Amino acid sequence: MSTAEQRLRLMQLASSNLPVGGYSWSQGLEWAVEAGWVPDVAAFERWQRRQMTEGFFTVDLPLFARLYRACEQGDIAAAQRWTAYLLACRETRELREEERNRGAAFARLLSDWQPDCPPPWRSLCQQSQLAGMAWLGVRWRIALPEMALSLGYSWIESAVMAGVKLVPFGQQAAQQLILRLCDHYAAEMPRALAAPDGDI
Amino acid sequence: MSTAEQRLRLMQLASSNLPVGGYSWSQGLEWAVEAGWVPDVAAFERWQRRQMTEGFFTVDLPLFARLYRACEQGDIAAAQRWTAYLLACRETRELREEERNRGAAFARLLSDWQPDCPPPWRSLCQQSQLAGMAWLGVRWRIALPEMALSLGYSWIESAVMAGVKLVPFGQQAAQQLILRLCDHYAAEMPRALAAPDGDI
């Protein structure tokens, strides 16, 4: 698959229009708003930088890296074990169910795009969108760091569009926030992708 | 040679959430639906392939390339002349006004992201989003072919999300259509970027 094709696929995986619904760490925000912690754009940025470094970069991204490496090695049993750890890291029953619902939504697309996808991997994708993304990344021969920018962009944009409604703030302020949160994501992603198993 | 920061900026420029309303060649669709030309996904794909090759690849992309080259050279007078030709290529009064409205919407973001944007370029951005995009691409040191994938993905996704509403068709079918239209866009972009002035 050409470099131009890979670029368009990454923008399609990153899109707020991807029909999947919600984002990890989202329940933090409505609590934080109601509690008085996010009155304005500056406080929203502080709150989201903390969710990106304490949640996304300690759980989602490192487990996405391990699912990608497992798929690359053809190691389904390892991908099953990492998906189990991911679900245990979503401590609540409710947040495990949200992870599985997003997985089922993404699996409907995955099997349409690549009918190719073996049943054990489709079954794993229904546990987490991260396992589905990881299989699709390897199938499309897209490097882990590229997939990880598309994952992060999608998460950043979802968190900002939710802030628009909850804080609230406007469309112009949203675009400046996405810019600054993308800068922080680019500076910190490599350390997050390199972190050892002990740091998850 | 795109950095991680540049890759996130390209996904932000590509986003359906960018607060600029509508997309070029859009007016075709409502007429074509009402007229009976676009009953289903297959007919919408035929219609959009024709708009991409006869409109976007003969007008928008080649003039975006010329605006990018003008900005690289610091040639504002050239960028003014190419923007004038772009507006004359929109044909109707209504479609020139739609181009200018999208330009004004993008200029509000451009001047927020880069207050450094000189008045002549801000003024040109209000004529067309393409001139604003072109200045921002050069300012951000993003290669023309990269910006062009982001521009094309945004246009493809806007056309498909409008088809979802107007035809109509569903979210799953939309994702397959974006995939096929992106493949056509990737195959045809380089010829469109290389076309001589006589082919616009």
Determine contact: A182 vs chain B, CB below 8 A: yes
Question: Distance between CA atoms of A35 and A166, rounded to whole angstroms?
Answer: 12
The length of chain A is 200
Single out the residue of A123, A139, A101, A193 nearest to residue A13, CA to CA.
A139
Residues of chain A neighbouring B8 (CB-CB closer than 8 A): 149, 152-153, 156, 182-183, 185-186
Rounded to a whole number, what is the distance in Å from the CA of B91 to chain A's nearest CA? 30
Give the number of other Cβ atoms within 10 Å of residue B60's Cβ.
25
CA nearest B113: which of A142, A195, A172, A35? A172
Chain B residues lying within 8 Å of A14, measured CB to CB: 11, 14
Contact between B32 and B162 under an 8 Å Cβ cutoff? The reply is no
Q: Report CB contact under 8 Å: B175, A5.
A: no
How far apart CA B39 and CA A33 sit, in angstroms, is: 45
CA separation for the pair A189, B12 (Å, rounded): 17
- Could you tell me how many helices (H) and strands (E) chain B has, helices first? 10, 0
Number of folded domains in chain B? 1
A115 in contact with chain B, both atoms CB, cutoff 8 A: no
> What resolution (Å)?
2.3
**Contact with chain B for residue A183, Cβ under 8 A:** yes
Query: Chain B contacts of A17, Cβ < 8 Å?
Result: 16, 157, 161, 174
B175 in A contact zone (CB under 8 Å): yes
d(CA B12, CA A177): 11
Amino acid identity of residue B175, one-letter, is: Q
What whole-number distance in Å separates Cα of residue B37 and Cα of residue B17? 29
Distance CA B137, CA A47 (A): 30
Q: How many residue pairs from chains A and B have C-beta atoms closer than 8 A?
A: 108
- Residue A23 burial (CB count, 10 A): 20
Q: Name the 3-class secondary structure at A110.
A: helix
Pick the residue from chain B with its C-alpha nearest to A18. B175
Range of the domain at A23: 1-200
In angstroms, the separation between the Cα of residue A129 and the nearest Cα of chain B is: 16
Q: For testing the chain A interface, which of B2, B5, B11 should be mutated: the one with the most A CBs within 10 Å?
A: B11
Q: What is the DSSP letter of A168?
A: T
* Maximum Cα interatomic distance, chain B, rounded to a whole number of Å: 49
Query: Which of B2, B5, B17 is the best residue to mutate to test the A interface, defined by the most A CB atoms within 10 Å of its own CB?
Result: B17
Which residues of chain A does B11 touch, with a Cβ-Cβ cutoff of 8 Å? Answer: 10-11, 14, 149-150, 153
The answer to whether the CB atoms of B11 and A12 lie below 8 A apart is no
Are residues A112 and B7, on separate chains, in Cβ contact within 8 Å? no
Closest CA to B180 of A105, A24, A113: A113
Cβ-Cβ contacts under 8 Å, B150 against chain A: 11
The residue written with tokens 């997309």 in the block is: B23
Whether residues A108 and B172 touch (CB distance < 8 A) is answered with yes
Question: Could you tell me the two tokens for B195?
Answer: 């076309």
Q: Tell me how far CA of residue B55 lies from CA of A179, B58, B131, B199, in angstroms.
A: 31, 5, 18, 12
Q: How is chain B split among helix, strand and coil, in percent rounded to 5?
A: 80, 0, 20
**Cα-based distances in Å from A3 to A7, A141, A177, B1:** 6, 10, 29, 13
* E strand or H helix that includes residue A123: helix A119-125
Q: Per the CB < 8 Å rule, is A153 touching B112?
A: no
Helix/strand/coil for B118: coil
Comparing CA positions, the residue from A1, A10, A24, A25 lying closest to residue A133 is A10
Peptide bond into A168 cis (omega under 30): yes
Contact assessment for residue B120 and residue B76, using Cβ atoms and an 8 Å cutoff: yes
- Judging by beta carbons within 10 Å of its beta carbon (0-12, 13-18, 19+), is residue A127 exposed, middle or buried? buried
Residue A124 CA to residue B86 CA, distance in Å, equals 50
Cβ-contact B158, B23 below 8 angstroms: yes
DSSP annotation of A118: -
Task: List chain A residues with CB under 8 Å of B172.
Answer: 19, 108-109, 112
- Contact residues on chain A for B174, CB-CB shorter than 8 A: 17, 19
CA dihedral A166, A167, A168, A171 (to 10 degrees): -90
**A109–B172 CB contact, under 8 Å:** yes
- The C-alpha of A153 sits at a distance from chain B's nearest C-alpha, in angstroms, of 6
Angle at B61 between CA B60 and CA B65, to 5 degrees: 120
Where is B119: in which H helix or E strand?
A: helix B119-125
Q: Dig out the tokens for B60 from the structure.
A: 């928008």
Query: CA–CA separation, B200 vs B196, rounded Å?
Result: 8
Classify B164 in phi/psi space as left (phi over 0), alpha (psi -120 to 50) or beta: alpha
The distance of Cα B102 from the centroid of its chain, to the nearest Å, equals: 10
CA distance B90 to B85: 9
- Distances A113 to A81, A101, A109, B97, B133 between C-alpha atoms, Å: 25, 19, 6, 39, 31
> Taking the CB of residue A187, how many other CB atoms lie within 10 A of it?
11
The closest alpha carbon to B7, from A1, A13, A102, belongs to A13
Nearest to A172 among B108, B146, B189 (CB): B108
